[PDB]
């Protein structure tokens, strides 16, 4: 009871691009959007998310901690104060703590990305929401429906519990 | 007609780590191993692949072109001339060609990571074969059996057709 389609960028034998399919999923959302992403600088996908939030959709966004200031800078350059949108909550996730060769204390990255809409559909894969994924790289995603969506829901809730208010806020 | 399980690193309720499951999948290979990977520097996984090849398994490895020298540096440190193992073929894959504002022509990366064994089982996800994914980062994979495996086989063949002999070789 799980169904899976594959999409690629650049595209193959499918009608829509990965980015057009991301916009579609966000426009179709009626209740909740849950996003986990490492780098988020795409202005067009951000605008879709904000519009969803003005419609009354609750939006929860989990970003990798090291790269967060790239997202904040984009929203500021768009003249948005993302802090003030009540229907969106943005929080950061760190990787593991570790000691380097020299004994310094660092943390790694959250290498996870997926979009979960209305607890019924997931896009999961290697596509990051930034210009380099449009113009420079090859990538792929899965569009997932059915029972496996519950597992993504559970994982989102576990990451949300770990996540923190961004230090920049 | 597809079954999918999830594994995480650091590990959650499941018995084995991602790295232990990779070693397992390789040891269980009877005919063919097909691997697509962005960076490969983990010696223990490389030892497993070489041992599979000595028992007559055919091994096809596709590596992101921009990161290839990290692999080559590892195999040489280990005292292995990988280009002399006839049951292993290593080839590189480039991202898209694009032109920067300075005019110089560059290419991006292949952002794709999966292990396909005997045309029957796939490990797909965000885990790269390097020390940072053991000690520093949070990552996840899918373990896939059934009809979806066929789509991974098609994609492998498509990337293999695109791929090139590495310039060092
Ligand atoms: O409403 C949700 N969930 C439904 C959407 C997918 C999984 C998360 N959460 C978000 C995290 C704070 C607790 C409520
Ligand atoms: O025999 C294979 N395999 C590829 C797909 C998974 C296993 C079977 N190939 C490798 C790619 C070039 C031609 C032969």
Curated annotation (Swiss-Prot), chains A, B:
Compartments reported by the entry: Cytoplasm; Membrane
Superkingdom classification of source: Eukaryota
UniProt modification remark: Phosphorylated in vitro by CSNK1A1.
Coiled coil stretches, renumbered: none
Subunit structure: Interacts with EGFR; positively regulates EGFR inducing its autophosphorylation in absence of stimulation by EGF. Interacts with RAF1; displaces 14-3-3 proteins from RAF1 and activates RAF1 within the RAS/MAPK signaling cascade. Interacts with AKT1, PIK3CA and PIK3R1; activates the PI3K/AKT signaling cascade. Directly interacts (via DUF1669) with casein kinase isoforms CSNK1A1, CSNK1A1L, CSNK1D and CSNK1E.
Entry similarity comment: Belongs to the FAM83 family.
Functional note: Probable proto-oncogene that functions in the epidermal growth factor receptor/EGFR signaling pathway. Activates both the EGFR itself and downstream RAS/MAPK and PI3K/AKT/TOR signaling cascades.
Domain notes: All members of the FAM83 family of proteins share a conserved N-terminal DUF1669 (domain of unknown function 1669) domain of about 300 amino acids. This domain mediates the interaction with casein kinase 1 (CK1) isoforms. Therefore, it has been proposed to rename DUF1669 the polypeptide anchor of CK1 domain.
Protein name per the record: Protein FAM83B
UniProt source species: Homo sapiens (Human)
């Amino acid at each position: 009871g799980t169904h899976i389609d594959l999409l690629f960028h650049p595209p193959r034998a499918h009608l829509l691009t990965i980015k057009e399919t991301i916009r579609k999923m966000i426009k179709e959302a009626r209740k909740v959007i849950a996003l986990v992403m490492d780098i988020f600088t795409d202005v067009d996908i951000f605008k879709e998310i904000v519009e969803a939030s003005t419609r009354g959709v609750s939006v929860y966004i989990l970003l990798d901690e090291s790269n967060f200031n790239h997202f904040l800078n984009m929203t500021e350059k768009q003249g948005c104060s993302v802090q003030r949108l009540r229907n969106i909550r943005v929080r950061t996730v760190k990787g593991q703590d570790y000691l380097s060769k020299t004994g310094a204390k660092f943390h790694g990255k959250m290498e996870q990305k997926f979009l979960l809409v209305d607890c019924q559909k997931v896009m999961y894969g290697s596509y990051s929401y930034m210009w380099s994924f449009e113009k420079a790289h090859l990538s792929m995603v899965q569009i997932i429906t059915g029972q496996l969506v519950e597992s993504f829901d559970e994982e989102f809730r576990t990451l949300y519990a770990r996540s923190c208010v961004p230090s920049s806020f």
